[PDB]
UniProtKB/Swiss-Prot annotation:
Residues 167-169 are annotated as: G5. Residues 129-132 are annotated as: G4. It comes from Shigella flexneri. PANTHER family: ELONGATION FACTOR TU, MITOCHONDRIAL, ELONGATION FACTOR TU-RELATED. This is Elongation factor Tu. One of its GO terms (molecular function) is guanosine tetraphosphate binding. GO terms for cellular component: cytosol. InterPro entries: EF-Tu_GTP-bd, EF-Tu_GTPase, EFTu-like_2, EFTU_2, G_TR_CS, P-loop_NTPase, Small_GTP-bd, T_Tr_GTP-bd_dom. Its main location: cytoplasm. Keywords: Acetylation, Cytoplasm, Elongation factor, GTP-binding, Hydrolase, Magnesium, Metal-binding, Nucleotide-binding, Protein biosynthesis. Mg(2+) binds at T19. The modification N6-acetyllysine is found at K307. Its EC number is 3.6.5.3. It is found in: Cytoplasm.
Length: 387
């Protein structure tokens, strides 16, 4: 502990070598700075996992650089990556997009990019692979344009992005000329990836779960400080639902123990000055003053479960009106489907425009669930906010 910890993963097109790279990384690193070398298969045969209520196939691996310690995840199929990205089951302070030099960019390449940004993947590094299969100076540089430029197409610094050329293969077999790229690749994670923003540091915030009124000199709302800190005296905004209202944090108690400040991650009951129980309700949230606005219309990438996992058994259509759980509650919304799209089948993902009846404190990257009679039928992340 203190050894900086970073969470990464290999994204990219199928067979482009995400997994093959993953391997090479631990190995190359084990041999060099000591550690544990992992076998392709132990990685290709991915166990499942259950997050937010779904089933993904994910392999978790570890390896260390000097200064840092990395947490790494590599998926089997695009979907796993899809689900994982949208849910966030596995976090990614950066991503190792994997591109083969024999195919150039591919649909999925795009997709994963598309998602990463949409989902708050802050940083992404690139390993041009299978370079062993290509000896064409000129060809390579074309790819970098194809890329640095596709990259910029989705709001990432294409012209400022690292691109490690290599052969995840040769390096896995033991061809030293090639290992250094894993090394070159590694170094980048260390220098290029800024240690993340911590939760406690991030802006203060708290989803209101319950609301009471004791004594009779101020009210008490409960819920988990999702982020930032809250110091008694720092005012707050109660955003969501009805017009926003202001107040001041008068008391912090966690199990009858009187305290002076709430930290991201703790469950607390905050005492507010001059606000009534009828002026506050679940769904709303305690947030540093001005750190978030409420909306009703938003663009989001969404996934509908299957029958096997427990989701709807049929498709749904426009004018569909399910519910959307946000941290603490459900809100009915109207669905708009991309041009072309006419019905969503269970097991599909679609960028879909939802329209809620009430306002909800929100910002891009938020994840929600979709439900029916309180049953979960899908999940999403607010890609972009509109209204
Ligand atoms: N020639 C060559 N083949 C490679 C290299 N890296 C991976 N491959 C091959 O590419 C295929 C797919 O690689 P893989 O890592 O499984 O891609 P994935 O489907 O994204 O996981 C495998 O059969 C590997 O042997 C490389 O550096 N050179
Ligand atoms: Mg694979």
């Amino acid at each position: 502990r203190t050894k900086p910890h970073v969470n990464v993963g290999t994204i990219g097109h199928v067979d482009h070598g995400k997994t093959t790279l993953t391997a090479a990384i631990t190995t190359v690193l084990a041999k060099t700075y000591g550690g544990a070398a992992r076998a392709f298969d132990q990685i290709d045969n991915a166990p499942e996992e259950k997050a937010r209520g779904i089933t993904i196939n994910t392999s978790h691996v570890e390896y260390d650089t000097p200064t840092r310690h990395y947490a790494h995840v590599d998926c089997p199929g695009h979907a796993d990556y899809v689900k994982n990205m949208i849910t966030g089951a596995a976090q990614m302070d950066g991503a190792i997009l994997v591109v083969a030099a024999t195919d150039g960019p591919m649909p999925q390449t795009r997709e994963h990019i598309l998602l990463g940004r949409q989902v708050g993947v802050p940083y992404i590094i690139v390993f041009l692979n299978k370079c062993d299969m290509v000896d064409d100076e000129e060809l390579l540089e074309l790819v970098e344009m194809e890329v640095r430029e596709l990259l910029s197409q989705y709001d990432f610094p294409g012209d400022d992005t690292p691109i490690v050329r290599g052969s995840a293969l040769k390096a896995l077999e033991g061809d030293a000329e090639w290992e250094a790229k894993i090394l070159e690749l590694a170094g980048f994670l260390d220098s290029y990836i800024p240690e993340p923003e911590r939760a406690i540091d991030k802006p203060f915030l708290l989803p209101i779960e319950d609301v009471f009124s004791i004594s009779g000199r101020g009210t008490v709302v409960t819920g988990r400080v999702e982020r930032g800190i809250i110091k008694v005296g720092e005012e707050v905004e109660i955003v969501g639902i009805k017009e926003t209202q202001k107040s001041t944090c008068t008391g912090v108690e966690m199990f009858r123990k009187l305290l002076d400040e709430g930290r991201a991650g703790e469950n607390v009951g905050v005492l507010l000055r001059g606000i009534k129980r009828e002026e506050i309700e679940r769904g709303q949230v305690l947030a540093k003053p001005g750190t978030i606005k409420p909306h009703t219309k938003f663009e989001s990438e969404v996934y509908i479960l299957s029958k096997d996992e427990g989701g709807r058994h049929t498709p749904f259509f426009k004018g569909y009106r399910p519910q959307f759980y946000f941290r603490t509650t459900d809100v009915t919304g109207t669905i708009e489907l991309p041009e072309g799209v006419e019905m969503v089948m269970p097991g599909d993902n679609i960028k879909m425009v939802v329209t809620l009846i009430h306002p909800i404190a929100m910002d891009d990257g938020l994840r929600f669930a979709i439900r029916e009679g309180g049953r979960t039928v899908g999940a999403g992340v607010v890609a972009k906010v509109l209204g």
